[PDB]
Paper text:
Among the ten hZnT members, hZnT1 is the only Zn2+ transporter predominantly located on the plasma membrane, mediating Zn2+ efflux from the cytosol to extracellular environments, to protect cells against Zn2+ toxicity. The overall structure of hZnT1 adopts a “mushroom”-shaped homodimeric architecture with the transmembrane domain (TMD) and cytosolic domain (CTD) of two protomers tightly packed. Each hZnT1 protomer comprises three parts: an extracellular domain (ECD), a TMD and a cytosolic CTD. The second part TMD of each hZnT1 protomer contains six transmembrane helices (TM1–6), forming a Zn2+ transport pathway.
The first region ECD (residues 271–312) is formed by the linker between TM5 and TM6, mediates intersubunit dimerization through hydrophobic interactions, a feature not observed in other ZnT family members. The distinctive extracellular cysteine-rich ECD in hZnT1 formed an inter-subunit disulfide bond (C291–C291) and two intra-subunit disulfide bonds (C276–C282, C286–C311). This unique arrangement is primarily responsible for sequestering extracellular Cu2+ and facilitating their efficient transport, while exhibiting minimal impact on Zn2+ transport, which expands the extra physiological function of hZnT1 beyond its role as Zn2+/H+ and Zn2+/Ca2+ exchanger. Specially, residues of TM2 and TM3 interdigitate at the dimer interface and establish a complex network of hydrophobic interactions to promote the dimer formation in the TMD. The transmembrane helices TM2, TM3, TM5 and TM6 are tightly bundled at the cytosolic half of the TMD in both protomers, and collectively create a cavity that is solvent accessible from the extracellular milieu but entirely sealed from the cytoplasmic side, indicating that our hZnT1 structure is in an OF state. Additionally, a His-rich loop flanked by TM4 and TM5 is located on the cytosolic side, with the majority invisible due to its flexible nature, except residues 134–136 near the C-terminal end of TM4 and residues 228–232 near the N-terminal end of TM5 build according to the map density. The last region CTD (residues 345–507) is composed of two short α helices (α1–2) and three paralleled β sheets (β1–3), contributing the extensive interactions to stabilize the dimeric state of hZnT1. Exquisitely, the β sheets of one protomer tightly pack against that of another protomer through hydrophobic interactions and four hydrogen bonds between H387–T415 and I417–Q418. In addition, K69, N70, and T71 in the extended loop between TM2–TM3 protrude into the neighboring subunit and tuck into the pocket between β1 and the loop of TM6-α1, establishing pivotal hydrogen bonds with L344, V347, and V374 to further strengthen the stability of hZnT1 homodimer. Superimposing the apo and CDDO-ME bound hZnT1 structures illustrated a noticeable significant movement of H43 and E99, which also substantiates that these conformational changes are indeed attributable to the binding of the inhibitor.
Numbering used by the authors:
A (entry chain B), B (entry chain A): 1 to 137, 228 to 424
Write the structure that this text describes.
């Protein structure tokens, strides 16, 4: 079918890819008897939640009819969804930041750099496919622009989440490559005091058999701090790419006048219309996309000739880009 | 001063209390050479962020004047703030849930139960003081109801965050009390294989000197799982207390018709008004609180007698609870 399933299909494909990646990561973790990848899958559950939130928002936005609960339809839901995703991403970012700071004080050494690297390339391929999926992020008949803008907002929130996942995958790949080529781990009997993190066994195990012996150093100190710093950078990048969307979404949900419309010129043109003596309560806001609604309380003098004045005001609003207007004539006290 | 500082003062007092608690926790952590409490302070930074977000929302909502950027003023900001907080809390909840699941697979034993318990009572006192602070969670002149509702939404989002912190403090107190009275830790030389959590050090240290010796058990197995389960319960509770507010906020930002107003009866009364032949584009929504806006396209026949029809329609809207209406008369084609 093709009943406006352009965005729903992409979201469903991304959800399917995320589920396959999560299943593969869980299988790899249980094969190698590792729990870090299981925790990574439980973190990917957040991406799953973001995808299902966007899917719910799109499904509710498909219902554009004027029901009893909502008079404009559930169009803003899509916009709301984007905002939600943005805020969600922001929260995740802060969480990551917190973890990063912890990893700057009690650094953890990664285990099995080769398998972690392979999972990293798998996640990189999945996230690249995702980014390719979301590469694009009387009244006239131009609802196509409104649909494009709402879809752009929602798909852009999901794109921000996928870009965060892709940056995390790049960081994982870089960290695994560095750990495999630079860092030297210690398992049993290796003469390494671990001058890097404070070590529970590498102190007690070594001292019993390294009494003034030829002890060595575990590895480079800067390697263990590559995972936090990069993450921090990614967070910053994410925050940057998260600032517009959120803002825009918030503005759309704050009844903020769209930037393409100026109120001074609009009210000047409204007051310049013949038969109009006063304009008050001129409220202009954006429902979603190109659906801009402007309600004004026009003051007139001749009730008989109100039709021409209303037509001229509607023409002025059409010229200014507003096509869903409600004009109230407050005639003089006769 | 008293220039509408009823909520700003409470938010500032809560921020001050949170900062003193964070400073005390950091001092206690650095005195006892512990980093778990430092991580707890970095997590309290999330409460600080929620408080400053609510403060920003309240400050922007104080600007009720109709500026050029926003025609309704930044009133919805407060509502938006609540939504943000709710979503933020939701994110935190999910994060906690994830951590809880990790603590169900690789449980961590808590250290220094007495000092952790004391920090728990300190946090309990701070959160109880906070809950006491937020214990309360032609057109008529009743903006007091709108202010009350907007403040209730924002202060209720902050109250949800503070209640989450209070539940976390209760869980910390209970866990510390249980660990102090039930669990038995192991530091050096104690014959305890620790069957709860698999530690390579505790196994390697014992086997060299416990060859068929009188070894003992570390402690009860159910104790280490008290921290996750309780947390999970708290999460559920939080989610419950988070569902209404979020919903309400979302509805207010979705232009949803308030539950106190029915559209069938409203449109029936509008069509029953003498001189009205058709009512279309009757859009009713809630700006914030009691500020309900309803714009309709009334169809009339006599342009001269439109004043009485408009007065009757305004009276009908006043009876139905809507006081900011825009009525457009679409007169017959003459």
């Amino acid at each position: 079918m093709g009943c406006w399933g352009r965005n729903r299909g992409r979201l469903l494909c991304m959800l399917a890819l995320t589920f396959m990646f999560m299943v593969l990561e869980v299988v790899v973790s249980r094969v190698t008897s590792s729990l870090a990848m299981l925790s990574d899958s439980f973190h990917m559950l957040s991406d799953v939640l973001a995808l299902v939130v966007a899917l719910v928002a799109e499904r509710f936005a498909r219902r554009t009819h004027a029901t009893q609960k909502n008079t404009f339809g559930w169009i803003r839901a899509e916009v709301m969804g984007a905002l939600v995703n943005a805020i969600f991403l922001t929260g995740l970012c802060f969480a990551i930041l917190l973890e990063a700071i912890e990893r700057f004080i009690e650094p953890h050494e990664m285990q099995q750099p080769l398998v972690v690297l392979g999972v990293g390339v798998a996640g990189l391929l999945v996230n690249v496919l995702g980014l390719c999926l979301f590469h694009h992020h009387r009244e006239p008949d131009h609802m196509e622009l409104e649909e494009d803008r709402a879809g752009q907002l929602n798909m852009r929130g999901v794109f921000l989440h996928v870009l965060g996942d892709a940056l995390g995958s790049v960081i994982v790949v870089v960290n695994a490559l560095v750990f495999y080529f630079s860092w030297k781990g210690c398992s049993e009997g290796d003469f390494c005091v671990n001058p890097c993190f404070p070590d529970p066994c590498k102190a007690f195990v070594e001292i019993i058999n390294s009494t003034h012996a030829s002890v060595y150093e575990a590895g480079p100190c800067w390697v263990l701090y590559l995972d936090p710093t990069l993450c921090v950078v990614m967070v910053c990048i994410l925050l940057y790419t998260t600032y517009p969307l959120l803002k825009e979404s918030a503005l759309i949900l704050l009844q903020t006048v769209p930037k393409q419309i100026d109120i001074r010129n609009l009210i000047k043109e409204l007051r310049n219309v013949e038969g109009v003596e006063e304009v008050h309560e001129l409220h202009v806001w954006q429902l979603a996309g190109s659906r801009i609604i402007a309600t004004a309380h026009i003051k007139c003098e001749d009730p008989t000739s109100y039709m021409e004045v209303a037509k001229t005001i509607k023409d002025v609003f059409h010229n200014h880009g507003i096509h869903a207007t409600t004009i109230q004539p407050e005639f003089a006290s006769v």
